[PDB]
């Protein structure tokens with residue numbers, strides 16, 4: 001629902017579970033860009049910042065722009081203002097309260113970081129309790145983000161076959177994170193969606209109610 005959760009279920013960074021590892025970089029393995037602190041928008045979405053080209057967040061100890069660096073989106077957790085709302089046939093969803101420009105950072109897909117054994121146990125539990133909402137995305141061959149038991153606002157974004165947001169996997173201080181980014185200009189009040197079918201995991205598949213002209217008919221089917 002759209003009520004404030006118990007605080008322990010709202011997490012701000014990914015939460016490793018059980019045997020799952022997270023990784024850290026030596027600062028010498030982190031790319032350093034050529035932007036200047038005096039630039040109009042140092043390391044911004046229109047810049048030529050090499051870190052952005054590599055989908056690597058600038059490290060705050062390293063980047064020449066320092067505190068003017070605009071390529072620290074994941075670490076700073078400054079997200080466009082959003083709100084949870086009830087849809088007609090797709091449960092709860094997420095909509096922006098502010099205009100968002102094409103390519104802008106919308107949110108990080110934050111959740112519990114689990115391995116495949118744990119993910120199987122959670123899907124089997126969902127099967128036994130008739131749970132029909134899933135919040136799992138593949139991070140890599142060993143790790144899955146599950147924003148179901150804990151997460152942030154991104155867990156409420158619904159699926160669309162012709163969405164207005166996309167996932168991008170970035171490197172942040174030596175480990176991978178999933179960011180959501182606008183595919184186009186989005187007006188305030190618009191529901192935020194992405195295409196689940198590239199990376200999602202769940203209990204089988206379910207009929208898609210996105211209603212897009214190109215609708216492929218299902219959530220849960222690799223294209």
Ligand SMILES: C[S@@+](CC[C@H](N)C(=O)[O-])C[C@H]1O[C@@H](n2cnc3c(N)ncnc32)[C@H](O)[C@@H]1O
Pocket residue numbers: 089090091092093132133134135155156157158159160206207208209210219
């Ligand atoms: C990541 S959650 C999104 C938030 C969810 N609607 C809720 O109320 O908590 C994904 C779940 O939302 C539902 N959903 C999202 N997009 C849908 C769509 N296009 N068609 C049908 N169900 C959808 C499915 O039940 C899916 O398991």
Ligand SMILES: Nc1nc2c(O)cc(SSc3cc(O)c4nc(N)sc4c3)cc2s1
Pocket residue numbers: 001002003004005009010011084147148149150151152153155
């Ligand atoms: N009035 C309101 N305040 C808040 C707020 O402060 C934070 C969020 S964000 S995160 C969240 C929300 C859930 O409902 C949830 N449920 C799980 N099982 S995990 C999880 C994570 C939503 C609302 S709505």
Ligand SMILES: *Sc1cc(O)c2nc(N)sc2c1
Pocket residue numbers: 132133134135196197199200201202203204205206219220221
């Ligand atoms: S991969 C996947 C993603 C979902 O959101 C989902 N929801 C269901 N009811 S099955 C399934 C699979």
Ligand SMILES: [Ca+2]
Pocket residue numbers: 047048
């Ligand atoms: Ca360029």
Ligand SMILES: [Ca+2]
Pocket residue numbers: 116141142
């Ligand atoms: Ca594997």
Ligand SMILES: [Zn+2]
Pocket residue numbers: 033034035042043044049050051058071
């Ligand atoms: Zn830069």
Ligand SMILES: [Zn+2]
Pocket residue numbers: 033035042043051058063064065066069070071
């Ligand atoms: Zn920078």
Ligand SMILES: [Zn+2]
Pocket residue numbers: 160161162208209210211212214215216217218
């Ligand atoms: Zn669809």
